[PDB]
Design a protein around this motif. Sequence first.
Motif, PDB file in Angstrom:
ATOM      1  N   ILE A 193       0.921  -1.137   0.000  1.00 34.99           N
ATOM      2  CA  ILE A 193       0.000   0.000   0.000  1.00 34.99           C
ATOM      3  C   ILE A 193       0.953   1.176   0.000  1.00 34.99           C
ATOM      4  CG2 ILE A 193      -1.731   1.297   1.395  1.00 34.99           C
ATOM      5  CD1 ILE A 193      -1.384  -2.395   1.842  1.00 34.99           C
ATOM      6  N   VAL A 194       0.931   1.958  -1.081  1.00 33.79           N
ATOM      7  CA  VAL A 194       1.852   3.042  -1.280  1.00 33.79           C
ATOM      8  C   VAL A 194       1.106   4.345  -1.078  1.00 33.79           C
ATOM      9  CG1 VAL A 194       3.311   4.232  -3.008  1.00 33.79           C
ATOM     10  CG2 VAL A 194       3.235   1.694  -2.937  1.00 33.79           C
ATOM     11  N   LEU A 195       1.674   5.226  -0.253  1.00 35.46           N
ATOM     12  CA  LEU A 195       1.242   6.630  -0.223  1.00 35.46           C
ATOM     13  C   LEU A 195       2.171   7.429  -1.099  1.00 35.46           C
ATOM     14  CD1 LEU A 195       0.065   5.266   2.410  1.00 35.46           C
ATOM     15  CD2 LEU A 195       0.086   7.663   3.292  1.00 35.46           C
ATOM     16  N   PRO A 196       1.728   7.800  -2.315  1.00 32.67           N
ATOM     17  CA  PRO A 196       2.697   8.370  -3.230  1.00 32.67           C
ATOM     18  C   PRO A 196       3.016   9.792  -2.837  1.00 32.67           C
ATOM     19  CG  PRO A 196       0.592   7.848  -4.337  1.00 32.67           C
ATOM     20  CD  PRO A 196       0.359   7.923  -2.846  1.00 32.67           C
ATOM     21  N   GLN A 197       3.904  10.410  -3.593  1.00 32.63           N
ATOM     22  CA  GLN A 197       4.541  11.666  -3.255  1.00 32.63           C
ATOM     23  C   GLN A 197       3.567  12.805  -2.937  1.00 32.63           C
ATOM     24  OE1 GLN A 197       8.224  11.797  -3.589  1.00 32.63           O
ATOM     25  NE2 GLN A 197       8.466  13.968  -3.059  1.00 32.63           N
ATOM     26  N   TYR A 198       2.471  12.915  -3.689  1.00 33.83           N
ATOM     27  CA  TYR A 198       1.567  14.053  -3.533  1.00 33.83           C
ATOM     28  C   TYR A 198       0.141  13.634  -3.097  1.00 33.83           C
ATOM     29  CZ  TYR A 198       5.385  16.103  -6.382  1.00 33.83           C
ATOM     30  OH  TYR A 198       6.611  16.546  -6.846  1.00 33.83           O
ATOM     31  N   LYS A 199       0.002  12.400  -2.623  1.00 32.08           N
ATOM     32  CA  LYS A 199      -1.297  11.811  -2.376  1.00 32.08           C
ATOM     33  C   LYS A 199      -1.274  10.927  -1.122  1.00 32.08           C
ATOM     34  CE  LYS A 199      -2.318  11.723  -7.316  1.00 32.08           C
ATOM     35  NZ  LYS A 199      -3.753  12.126  -7.337  1.00 32.08           N
TER      36      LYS A 199
END
Lengths: 95, 97
Positions: A81-87
């Motif tokens: 589960i990735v929390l990406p750079q701007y989200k």
Amino acid sequence: GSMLNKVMLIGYLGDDPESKTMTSGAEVVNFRMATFEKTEWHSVVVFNPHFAKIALQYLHKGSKVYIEGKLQTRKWYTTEIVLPQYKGELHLLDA
Amino acid sequence: GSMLNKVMLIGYLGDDPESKTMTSGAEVVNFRMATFEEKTEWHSVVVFNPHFAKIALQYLHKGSKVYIEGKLQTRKWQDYTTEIVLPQYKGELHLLD
Ligand SMILES: [Ca+2]
């Protein structure tokens, strides 16, 4: 039209958040978390810099969190589960 | 207290849905679907809810657009795979074509 890739989890951290320095020079925070109705272990990866520092400053083994992220699979297979750079979302509950 | 394990997907099937009959004698539907905003993401979907399973077999095909709501599950296999599961009495599957 729309397209969507969204995971929502409320659960408890398995260890302290760990921090690895990327190729980019950015800090990327990783932890594992459990959800249950026996228990599901989810591998979470935080690139969002703001939520990363918050994980390191405020989360620890046993912490309850609320997480929104994107499902991503990488080919050495592992789904995270990735929390990406701007989200993404990361919130400490029970504080 | 509160607990939540929920995944929401809107994307396109990479292949026609497949029916397998389990150990249970339960009929389970699987398919892979793709999402995109580095690469496109393939999600492995497993539908136990008999109602959404029948809908997937009857109405979904390679390339069909679908909205899926399930839960994230990883299972050990001997030699791990993470799947979006629509459990026996829960989940949501909606046709968007
Ligand atoms: Ca908050």
